């Protein structure tokens, strides 16, 4: 499907550290190379090295392998959003439930949206996941610490983006419409969703949902979606052919002072004229969700598997 800016990394030693880069286009480049997932693993699970060797982000595994949104290199996964500061992919704890369905065996990182957040599981050096996903057993094949991208599993068809916040009263309204669309559901990922006399054990649950920036997600059955292209600065990346992403200084200058190269859309809305070149990130645009008579621009929208208990009467 191809990357946004940067072709897949070819790392040299597992012990090289990863710099913090201030520039937007540089961060996008780290994301194309799964530098951010590598960093997550080093921070949380005693991992040494990198994931994404050669293939980069375009070669990661998705659990519904039929995945629409990865066909667009520019739509952001939860890990992608975490590197840009829009949300935190937390380390899993014992109460977080691994969903059945994915092929966990041999994965070194996986991540799923939960009802109230985003949760990830990583493996230490020389290890990879058992088939239940519950433990990391030894795996001599991962001993180099420079692992291919199919060891990274992203659960769900998910798109994340900058949101326009909504007041708390609007959230409580959306929460009410969700409760009436799913009367049969008691808990989702351990969070009370409806009041129930008696409940079944937790079951796999595929559902459409949106993150609108409050205490938990809004799950949805009947809803409409629409894409608007807005040509703001985050929709463009800046590079210099044969050298990778431009620096932070060069990028701000290209996007303020209209004095760099560009494609049609970047010149049309920003102005142009050795120098850097900026062009359009490949995506349908920003997603807007219509639910319960409202329109909302969520932080994340997607379809994805969670755990839920159903009512037994």
């Amino acid at each position, epitope marked *: 499907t191809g990357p946004i800016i940067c072709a897949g990394p070819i790392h040299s030693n597992k012990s090289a550290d990863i710099p913090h880069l201030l520039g937007y286009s540089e961060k996008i480049c780290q994301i194309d190379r799964l530098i951010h997932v590598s960093s997550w693993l080093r*921070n949380h*699970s005693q991992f040494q090295g990198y994931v994404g060797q050669r293939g980069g982000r375009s070669q990661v595994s998705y659990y519904p392998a039929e995945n629409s949104y990865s066909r667009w290199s520019g739509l952001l996964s939860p890990c992608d959003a975490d590197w840009l500061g829009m949300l935190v992919v937390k380390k899993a*704890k014992g109460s977080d439930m691994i969903v059945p369905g994915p092929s966990y065996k041999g994965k070194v990182f996986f991540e799923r949206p939960t009802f109230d957040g985003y949760v990830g*599981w990583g493996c230490g050096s020389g*290890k990879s996941r058992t088939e*239940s996903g*519950e*433990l990391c057993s*030894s795996d001599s094949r991962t001993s180099s610490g420079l692992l291919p991208s199919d060891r990274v599993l992203w659960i769900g068809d998910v798109a994340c983006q900058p949101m326009t916040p909504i007041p708390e009263e609007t959230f409580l309204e959306l929460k009410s419409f969700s409760q009436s669309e799913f009367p049969d559901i008691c808990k989702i990922d351990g969070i009370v969703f409806n009041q129930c006399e008696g409940e079944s054990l937790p079951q796999p649950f595929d559902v459409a949902w949106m993150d609108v920036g409050h205490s938990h997600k809004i799950i949805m059955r009947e809803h409409k979606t629409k894409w608007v292209q807005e040509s703001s600065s985050k929709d463009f990346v800046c590079y210099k052919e044969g050298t990778g992403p431009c620096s932070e200084s060069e990028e701000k200058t290209c996007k303020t002072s209209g004095s760099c190269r560009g494609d049609m859309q970047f010149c049309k809305v920003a102005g142009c004229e050795a120098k850097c070149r900026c062009s359009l990130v490949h995506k349908p645009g920003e997603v807007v969700v219509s639910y319960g008579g409202m329109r909302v621009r969520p932080k994340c929208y997607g379809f994805s598997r969670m755990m839920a208990t159903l009512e037994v009467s």
Partner: antibody
Amino acid sequence: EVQLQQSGPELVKPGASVKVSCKASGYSFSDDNMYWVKQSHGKSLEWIGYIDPDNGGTSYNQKFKGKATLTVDKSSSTAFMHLNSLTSEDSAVYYCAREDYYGSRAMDYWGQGTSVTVSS
Amino acid sequence: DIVLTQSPASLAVSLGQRATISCKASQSVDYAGDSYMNWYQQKPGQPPKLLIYAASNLESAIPARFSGSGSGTDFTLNIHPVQEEDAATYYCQQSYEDPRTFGGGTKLEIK
């Protein structure tokens, strides 16, 4: 590297209390539960309790509920164990250990141990 | 609580020979394809050191003379070829449920 560092040996009088510390470094403190284990001299290892440093939630061995109290300080990466109403039956080496729930579900890093002698 | 019974309580093995230690649980510690059983080595004055987690996984930097096997309730720690540094007390420990429990331990002496 993960490392856990316990406070030094302790001499305390019967009926008194004692507080032991365990300082974690080399990883993000609130990611993993911290366990506490008792080992009387020559005897076997016994579980006392654990604490989730992210939110303070605790679980105790029934044998030590009311005897031991577990706390942490997030800002300084330290876990604490308070022992009260000391008798001679509380003299032992006490360990802290980090559990890697989704890696090995084992206690893969331990502190060096804190010797506690209860006598007058 | 899940009670763990180690045997023998004490065992003597000649250098270069094989040591075989047993642990029996009073209930299964298996769940969805893994066995939640760990083995620790403890020398006098030091903390336990993790050798084997989940029945058969060697912790990093543990020599391949150590191996573990078993499933459900019956587990084995093998040391072959036994060496001088292997003199210690070996503990099993189940991680299936709260409360964690430990076996009584097996002291390995060298002949």
